[PDB]
């Protein structure tokens with residue numbers, strides 16, 4: 001049982017190929033998860049949105 | 061053989077930031093050269109995106125900007141990055157010149173001088189820049205200033221109307237300024253390269269003013285990454301404004317269109333001309349005021365002729381070190397006064413600060429230098 | 439332009455160095471860091487600070503007198 | 518109950534209830550008594566003289582300050 | 594007249610750093626604009642569609658747009674009739690010629706409202722204070738006709754009638770139209786009529802801080818790595834003899 005960082009280096013960081021592949025694969029998932037958590041944090045500290053305002057106007 | 065060295069193009073790039081030997085020694089005060097570069101391109105870059113939506117014509121001028129801010133997808137960040145980047149371009153320009161005096165960098169005549177040419181041009185550019193939205197400050201800002209050439213004996217009148225396209229500021233004046241505000245940053249960008257050309261002839265000065273030939277490091281790693289971090293810091297600041305305090309450095313009244321009938325008792329050029337503004341009106345003269353305003357900047361080109369010290373940097377010069385800060389604070393004074401109305405305390409103190417400025421650079425620092433020589437037995 | 443190899447003449451100096459992957463990027467960041475910035479601050483307060491408080495004193499007194507010049511103006515006008 | 522109803526659609530405003538409550542503390546009664554002293558003073562010699570804009574403004578500063586501090590908790 | 598006073602710090606729901614506007618409060622504000630200000634105050638830059646994402650909804654915006662009649666494009670005979678209300682066009686209202694604003698309100702220009710919060714020092718608070726400020730002239734003093742009194746005003750001699758307390762309403766669901774409640778809402782809307790981007794701006798600003806919060810340390814640890822070779826380098830001078 002080596003180290004996380006060790007195993008990480010061997011399988012993905014060593015070759016500049018996989019190294020770069022890792023970051024483009026890692027950026028896609030990051031943009032998504034960071035935008036979720038972020039906006040959520042932005043809403044949680046607010047709530048005078050147009051989100052909770054809609055419930056009132058589904059009609060016309 | 062390494063193509064990175066023999067290819068006509070790369071050579072230049074190798075010489076610019078890869079193999080160029082630099083002092084193992086420079087510190088943060090040397091970052092503002094990249095920052096000014098970054099500033100210049102980012103300015104050119106947002107500036108261009110605004111031009112695909114801006115207009116000119118006095119009727120639509122103001123309207124287009126608001127169009128951008130409200131209607132143009134993302135036009136607001138672009139507009140505000142442009143306007144805030146403009147201020148940052150001054151903070152750095154200011155810091156750069158600062159670094160320069162303190163450390164004696166000005167001993168590279170050609171380089172220093174190109175830098176003065178670089179100063180006047182970005183000043184001349186940014187001036188035209190704010191006339192564009194056609195706000196209140198834009199109109200009289202564009203009026204109070206330009207006029208100054210009317211103080212020039214015998215022909216002042218002719219020139220000010222020639223630069224105007226009429227008898228006042230209108231039609232002919234906004235289109236003119238837009239076009240000039242468009243072509244200048246390109247010309248500046250060229251001059252910058254010549255600035256940088258002459259700089260490579262000697263390599264960089266450093267915090268000690270000694271000479272680092274005995275200890276140079278490659279721009280590769282070292283100053284490329286120390287330029288990246290640095291640029292990130294410049295982004296933090298520019299974004300702090302744009303995204304949290306968009307109008308903090310902006311005069312709220314360049315909102316509300318023009319009006320050759322009005323003039324709102326206050327009016328000052330953008331912050332970065334305040335020290336200069338203060339100088340000019342701290343003189344009861346049309347000719348003297350503008351003459352003094354000119355000297356206020358054109359004196360940089362005089363500094364090297366008054367280097368008196370046997371050491372280059374002020375790193376080991378307490379006396380001058382004191383007069384340096386007195387200069388900075390005093391400029392911070394002029395900036396503050398410039399920002400105030402021409403009334404009671406404010407007049408006499410801004411009048412003293414002016415004299416100080418010129419007496420400090422023209423008599424005090426040069427003498428501090430000689431005394432230090434004498435103290436050291438030099 | 440000037441390249442390495444044509445810079446200048448150096449006599450007898452040895453320079454030992456170490457791989458970045460073999461050392462810490464932040465040796466004693468705080469342990470040795472703080473003490474040093476105290477030391478550099480101390481070393482320079484006296485030449486940097488004074489002109490700024492001078493401006494500081496002139497700034498607060500300056501606005502003071504600006505208000506007390508007009509607002510305070512009346513004052514007395516008794517008849 | 519029913520008397521308070523007419524009181525609503527005909528009166529009521531959180532600004533006045535607060536103004537009067539703020540017009541009460543130290544700096545205010547003092548800034549009003551500097552203002553009343555001058556009020557009497559210029560309408561005493563009720564003819565041919567100066568102004569009194571000044572003493573009013575100092576009162577409104579001190580009030581409107583503490584006005585802003587609590588006021589907004591009542592609104593909606 | 595030469596002396597002046599500046600506004601206090603009303604704790605707006607959007608004064609804090611990452612603080613969104615109150616969309617419910619932007620609504621009531623538009624109402625205050627339409628019923629009251631709109632018959633004197635031009636608002637050349639905002640439009641009914643601008644309201645769509647903000648406060649109202651699709652159909653609602655259409656309806657409010659239809660409650661006026663604007664002069665549409667000319668037709669075949671070179672006409673220029675009138676039409677219900679789209680969504681497209683703005684709120685160009687009160688007067689044609691600018692001097693016609695002067696002919697109505699005695700020689701005074703009620704300036705555009707899109708401006709306002711960013712064209713006057715203090716922003717919302719100056720407009721909030723100027724509206725709920727309205728006080729009575731003490732001694733000395735004068736006035737021409739009805740050049741009303743206001744302390745929060747340059748010179749104190751305005752030409753604007755105090756159209757505050759005239760309790761108008763339609764605060765759907767139930768909201769007391771008191772002077773102060775009415776002033777907060779106009780301002781809150783006026784903030785949004787000047788800086789619509791306001792909330793997105795700060796949303797990004799959060800990400801900007803949050804991003805830089807990971808990057809600054811990182812791009813800094815990177816530079817350390819590379820400079821560490823230089824930082825721990827050891828010199829020895831070994832001259833002959």
Ligand code: HEM
Nearest residue numbers: 090091092093094096097165171172175176178179264265
């Ligand atoms: C278009 C605006 C300018 C740009 C883009 C620019 C760019 C640069 C760059 C990249 C450097 C090398 C890095 C550094 O030392 O920071 C530099 C150094 C220098 N510049 Fe500028 N600069 C500009 C304005 C100025 C000004 C205002 C001056 C002084 C009037 C100036 C005179 C110098 C001098 C003397 C140096 C040498 C600094 C040293 O060796 O320590 N340039 N500049």
Ligand code: HEM
Nearest residue numbers: 103104107108110111114143146149186189190192242245
């Ligand atoms: C050649 C690239 C540039 C272009 C295409 C450009 C074009 C424009 C346009 C169309 C405007 C009016 C829109 C607006 O005000 O937001 C503007 C405003 C301005 N830009 Fe530029 N400009 C460029 C480079 C610069 C430079 C080098 C500076 C100096 C830092 C500069 C500083 C300004 C200033 C001060 C304003 C007006 C201030 C304000 O927005 O309130 N821009 N520019």
Ligand code: HEM
Nearest residue numbers: 629630633698701702703704713720751752753754756779
């Ligand atoms: C809540 C609705 C209204 C608001 C928020 C409003 C707000 C304002 C503001 C902020 C100013 C300029 C203040 C300054 O220069 O610093 C102004 C000027 C004026 N508006 Fe209004 N107003 C409203 C309704 C009216 C109405 C109903 C009238 C018709 C009596 C009116 C006629 C004026 C006039 C005559 C001025 C000129 C004041 C002057 O510059 O001398 N406005 N208004």
Ligand SMILES: CCCCCC[C@H]1C(=O)O[C@H](C)[C@H](NC(=O)c2cccc(NC=O)c2O)C(=O)O[C@@H](C)[C@@H]1OC(=O)C(C)C
Nearest residue numbers: 076077086090091093094096097249252253256264283287
């Ligand atoms: C397009 C980007 C490629 C770069 C080529 C052009 C840019 C260029 O030439 O790059 C190098 C990086 C040039 N010098 C430095 O940065 C620099 C020099 C000594 C020390 C430091 N830092 C810390 O000690 C530096 O940062 C510098 O920073 O000058 C810019 C103004 C120029 O930029 C310009 O010309 C403009 C006219 C484009």
